[PDB]
Amino acid sequence: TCPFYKKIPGTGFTVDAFQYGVVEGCTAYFLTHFHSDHYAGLSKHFTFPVYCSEITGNLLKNKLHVQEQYIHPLPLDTECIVNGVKVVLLDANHCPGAVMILFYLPNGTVILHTGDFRADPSMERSLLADQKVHMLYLDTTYCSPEYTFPSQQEVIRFAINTAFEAVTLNPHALVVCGTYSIGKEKVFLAIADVLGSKVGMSQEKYKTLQCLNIPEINSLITTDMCSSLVHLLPMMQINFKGLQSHLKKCGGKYNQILAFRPTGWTHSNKFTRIADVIPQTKGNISIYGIPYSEHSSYLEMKRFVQWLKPQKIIPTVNVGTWKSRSTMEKYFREWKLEAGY
Ligand code: NI
Secondary structure, eight states: OOOGGGEETTTTEEESOOSSSSOTTOSEEEOOOOOHHHHTTOOTTOOSOEEEEHHHHHHHHHHSOOOGGGEEEEOTTOOEEETTEEEEEEEOSSSTTOEEEEEEOTTSOEEEEOOSOOOOGGGGGSGGGGSOOOEEEEOOTTOSTTOOOOOHHHHHHHHHHHHHHHHHHOTTEEEEEEESSSOOHHHHHHHHHHHTOOEEOOHHHHHHHHTSOOTTGGGTEESOGGGOSEEEEEGGGOSHHHHHHHHHHTTTSOSEEEEEEEESOOGGGTTOOGGGOOOEEETTEEEEEEEOOSSOOHHHHHHHHHHHOOSEEEEOSSOSOHHHHHHHHHHHHHHHHHHTO
């Protein structure tokens, strides 16, 4: 049964609620982004209207084979009417095609559902600036002050400078980057750009990337692994055994691997600066875990909420334990007392 925090009161609507069967009273199913914990349940047999971004609707049609007649893509930053209710989709600064949803209820209540997001001051000048928001359905993934990480730009700087150094010292080194979902494409695209290579990958991953409207993409990716010196592999293969095996397959073209695992947060964050990150090494294989996050840090989240000043917060992440829930509620009250709303 669908949990309460996936239901939008005063509407026929649900958000990211595809694994519960037919939800009683739901006239339109919204999908914030194409990550499996959120789309779980969709397939070619789904026959209700699904509302989403253009990019998400490309992925629904091509990857999950949802039929066209049930996909309702909406433009961003544009007032639209759905089953009699005004909605707006906003960029969530998450993965490609990920949105936040503003709902303008018939009784005057305004609700923001962030989906998954990485808060940013740029959001303070979107259409959110223009009216009051009463209820916030909030991505609370890293809602605790231990969760600090660097900007995306600092992390990409580290990665480019590390890859360029290694390959210039050894033109026979291969770079490998791990992936298991869409998101974080900047990691592998920025490294391939500095090296003058295309990124090589499986046919299944190339297909996914071709749904993303990324400019000039035919220029940056390929299925011809032999012509590429940056390869993408499944995240599970980014270990010494998996990498040794891959290196065997390249037929003596390469004699070293430098590999990257873009994790979110790891407790190496609580002690070490990005400048100071070091790899794990075995023989001619090195693996770097880099803290490239597509969710808000604690401070980014706090800033967003203290700017928005909502009347009520509904967490959508870490809701399964009483300790988590009590922790989050304590921080929400601190924020409200410090800011004065
Ligand atoms: Ni996500």
